[PDB]
Amino acid sequence: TAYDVILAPVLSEKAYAGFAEGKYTFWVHPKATKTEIKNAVETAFKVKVVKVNTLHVRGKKKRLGRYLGKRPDRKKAIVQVAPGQKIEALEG
RNA sequence: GUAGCGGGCGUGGAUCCCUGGAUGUCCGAAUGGGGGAACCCGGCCGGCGGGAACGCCGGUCACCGCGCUUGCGCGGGGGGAACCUGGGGAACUGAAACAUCUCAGUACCCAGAGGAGAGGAAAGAGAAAUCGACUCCCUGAGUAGCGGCGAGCGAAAGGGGACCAGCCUAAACCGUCCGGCUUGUCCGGGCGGGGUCGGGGGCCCUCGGCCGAAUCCCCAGCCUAGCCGAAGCUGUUGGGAAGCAGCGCCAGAGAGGGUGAAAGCCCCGUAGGCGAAAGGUGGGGGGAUAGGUGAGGGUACCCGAGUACCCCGUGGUUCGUGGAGCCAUGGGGGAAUCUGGGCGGACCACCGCCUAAGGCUAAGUACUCCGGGUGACCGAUAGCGCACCAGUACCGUGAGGGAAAGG
RNA sequence: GAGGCCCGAACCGGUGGGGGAUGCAAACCCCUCGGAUGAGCUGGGGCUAGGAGUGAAAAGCUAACCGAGCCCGGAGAUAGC
RNA sequence: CGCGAGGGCGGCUGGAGGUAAGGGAAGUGCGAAUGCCGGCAUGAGUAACGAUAAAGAGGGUGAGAAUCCCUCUCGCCGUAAGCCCAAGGGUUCCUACGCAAUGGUCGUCAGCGUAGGGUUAGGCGGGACCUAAGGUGAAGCCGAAAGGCGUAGCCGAAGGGCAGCCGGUUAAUAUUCCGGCCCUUCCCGCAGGUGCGAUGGGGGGACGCUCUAGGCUAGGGGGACCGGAGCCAUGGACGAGCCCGGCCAGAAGCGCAGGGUGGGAGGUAGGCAAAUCCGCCUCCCAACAAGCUCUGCGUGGUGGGGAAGCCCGCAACCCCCCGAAGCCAGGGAGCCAAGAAAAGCCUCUAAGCACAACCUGCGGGAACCCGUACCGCAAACCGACACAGGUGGGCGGGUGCAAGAGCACUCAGGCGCGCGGGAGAACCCUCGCCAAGGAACUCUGCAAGUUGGCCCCGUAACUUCGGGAGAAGGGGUGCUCCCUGGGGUGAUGAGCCCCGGGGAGCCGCAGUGAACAGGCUCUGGCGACUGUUUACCAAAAACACAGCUCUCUGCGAACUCGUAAGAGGA
């Protein structure tokens, strides 16, 4: 119950654009989302996170019913000045 | 739930089916506190990240009722289709108006009980040299009665059946521990022993002989998966044989469904017969604890109190004020302990019945959320509101209303 | 520089007329009108209920028909029509 | 073949059930119940297509367009028909594909269909802060059960309280991301200082309406001045022309406006005796201040932004004037109806502790949860609809008119209302005009007209004396030129605005030349008056109203609600 926080890297133009500097966001855990997911990502990608931000989401979809995904909380960790590493050049 | 990629696992016995276990976010009796259910915020102990601020992680903290010196240990709370008991408790209607009466102690509301609930071992019944807890059914009986004697309401005993079961206490009397007091060989609180009645029990002397749980146990048996199960070929028309035609065969199995059309013998089955490591259940038959086991003779110590009883006000019963008891009981008065007290329809007197004011008690009875089996039951405008992704869509602030649609 | 003062926007209202009448609308539009520092208007948060509430009082209002709301139930009320 | 209800036969269709004689059972026979459910008709190619703000054309794309994109014209809003915020709504946001249906037409389009994106906060708004009404509710009171009151406590906001301004970024977010400048809390270490220390005491927080002063700022108007690519048209103008732009934020420190506040020194029956803190008494000084505090505004190191202009892309920033409803703010004056609470915040001592703890500094650190798309006077909310209706707050430019949020035109910005095309009848709606006459109309001058603003004359009865008063009834208003009186800021002189006054003279039918914009009088009834009322036929002479009278009520009041407790009265 220590990694079940970071879920998947997010992938959108906006997502990648981030790489430039302040890292990108990964879909985190709805709750326990605690912006304190810093000593969470830095224990997985081994780095210094200097700032965190968070959001929410998921829409509907049709046919016979509705309601999509969840309402995933999610958002970018800034990472120290320069250490920005791994997964960067990966996928673009 | 198939359709698809994309990957994989199985006789090294998968998937599946039964049994037990594990994990089980958050809200909900909801129980750390809050709150606009599913969210927000905290105490205390411990552990994570460099961790002091921050943040996660695991425990743990509601309140109420009973029993031990302060902490504790047992319990409660909410839900459930009906069925059940109690506490409250209508009107429409009927009376061809309406007020008594009726509907009706019904509808509903509330509390509570549980696989049932209730009731239950006589202060009974009622005329029988009588009967012998209670409940249920059939009668008795639309009788007896009740009733603006209208409308209408309506027993009980007795007789058939189902079931079958009986039991503890309070008080005399003895012992013991404790805290109060007028430090009196006394008062009452708690345990133990005794004692449970149509007549008995206590206490003194005289004579001493066993049945049996409603509670604990064990196995059977029965649920909760399964396994075995007989007997048919050829030809022929047909899109398709189970039809038709010719020879058979099984049968404790000729119930049923299914297979391209109408099959006992093709498939699943059916008759019949086997199966449980595990968990439920389980006197039906048996083991063991609990507990219970006699007869006379004497005092004249006990036998359930604001009770009986009488009176005023009411309720229940067939009983509506009636000649109106009995059973309940709000108010007032207020006893006795077997030379006691209640009842047998005012009241007396006879004659007889029964032992009030403490409690428990199986079964036979009721119901159908749930599982199975049948139907001179429906077959999609029917049958449940739903055969289908329905208490949905849609409607309504809300309570609530509530479809259509199968091949 | 006073005022239940005056004219007049906003804002509140609803006088008269026309139109509308299977409407733009289950009360509307146009012109014209009343009030407009007050017994004013208005947002937000609260409280009062069915023989009851509220009512500067019309039996008015209480979720588009109120001389007794709506829903479910008694219920297949009763109907000499 | 049966009298008939029906019963057989035959032919096409259909493709899997059916059911004799003779009998038995019923949910057993439909044309009507304004029956119920479904389907389909008639009216009918008829009415309508939802505001009379308005359209046209050229290019594009495309199977196909009046209806989609682009361009140029025209028109309509402009206290909006424009921007920003709440609520509510929940992806309607942006992008790529699409048109069956949904759009009252069309559809290449969309708020529609499929898919993928998008919402980033210590300082914004909420919560780990405060209380209001009122809820809830340990105790406690009361009720047949449900349950009713209710102390403390808790909950409860648009009210109190608390630290971010200016730019830049994306298709879609931004006070959230980025830059610049500026802050707030917690924690730790260090240095230097003090009696430290509450849920308890005190102060404070802290308040009405109307009217107002002085300074500011927002906002807006000028310029002969600053810098500008440029343009001379159509008769003239090479002009001190025309045209565009002439700011924003910003610490400490400076200035300018304010708001707060007496300083002492002793006593003390109070603040549930604990305070050297309040509160009260006493007396040296002091006083329409100073000082000390605390705001706002300028200024500020500095950063930011920066048009019109052709090809397809150039770099100032000053000077006056008007000027708030906003700010300094808890300012002032006046009045009667006499105008929240609590916390944060100061201060005072208690327990306890002083090796704690606080206070100021400086450095390092730490800083969670929720909201953030988009619509938002509307086609995204409430009205069954893409409904001419309903919906709280802020901003809301310019000129002109006495003023203004009015009226007319117009900036920015946004719209031309999701059917069109022709005709050019009756009739209907809405609108303009009319000879002569002027209420003859009609229930009625209903309706429509006339009048309309401002300045100056001038105005009766009656009166409660305020008022009848805009009584009535008149005259003036435009434009040019001349002289002249005071004002505000400058500075006392100049521009700049602000109110006047006096003479001439010009033109038209007409000078508030358009739009906003009273017709009046005499006399009765009723009701004093402003008010209120039947949401959706009655706005009144009805209700109310100050005011008068009768009457109940001595306080555990009477009276009302409730079974009661209890509450209202108060």
From Swiss-Prot:
<dbReference type="Pfam" id="PF00276">
    <property type="entry name" value="Ribosomal_L23"/>
</dbReference>
<keyword id="KW-0699">rRNA-binding</keyword>
<dbReference type="GO" id="GO:0005840">
    <property type="term" value="C:ribosome"/>
</dbReference>
<keyword id="KW-0687">Ribonucleoprotein</keyword>
<dbReference type="GO" id="GO:0019843">
    <property type="term" value="F:rRNA binding"/>
</dbReference>
<dbReference type="InterPro" id="IPR013025">
    <property type="entry name" value="Ribosomal_uL23-like"/>
</dbReference>
<dbReference type="GO" id="GO:1990904">
    <property type="term" value="C:ribonucleoprotein complex"/>
</dbReference>
<dbReference type="InterPro" id="IPR012677">
    <property type="entry name" value="Nucleotide-bd_a/b_plait_sf"/>
</dbReference>
<dbReference type="GO" id="GO:0003735">
    <property type="term" value="F:structural constituent of ribosome"/>
</dbReference>
<dbReference type="GO" id="GO:0006412">
    <property type="term" value="P:translation"/>
</dbReference>
<keyword id="KW-0694">RNA-binding</keyword>
<protein>
    <recommendedName>
        <fullName>Large ribosomal subunit protein uL23</fullName>
    </recommendedName>
</protein>
<comment type="function">
    <text>One of the early assembly proteins it binds 23S rRNA. One of the proteins that surrounds the polypeptide exit tunnel on the outside of the ribosome. Forms the main docking site for trigger factor binding to the ribosome.</text>
</comment>
<comment type="similarity">
    <text>Belongs to the universal ribosomal protein uL23 family.</text>
</comment>
<dbReference type="InterPro" id="IPR012678">
    <property type="entry name" value="Ribosomal_uL23/eL15/eS24_sf"/>
</dbReference>
<keyword id="KW-0689">Ribosomal protein</keyword>
<comment type="subunit">
    <text>Contacts protein L29, and trigger factor when it is bound to the ribosome. Part of the 50S ribosomal subunit.</text>
</comment>
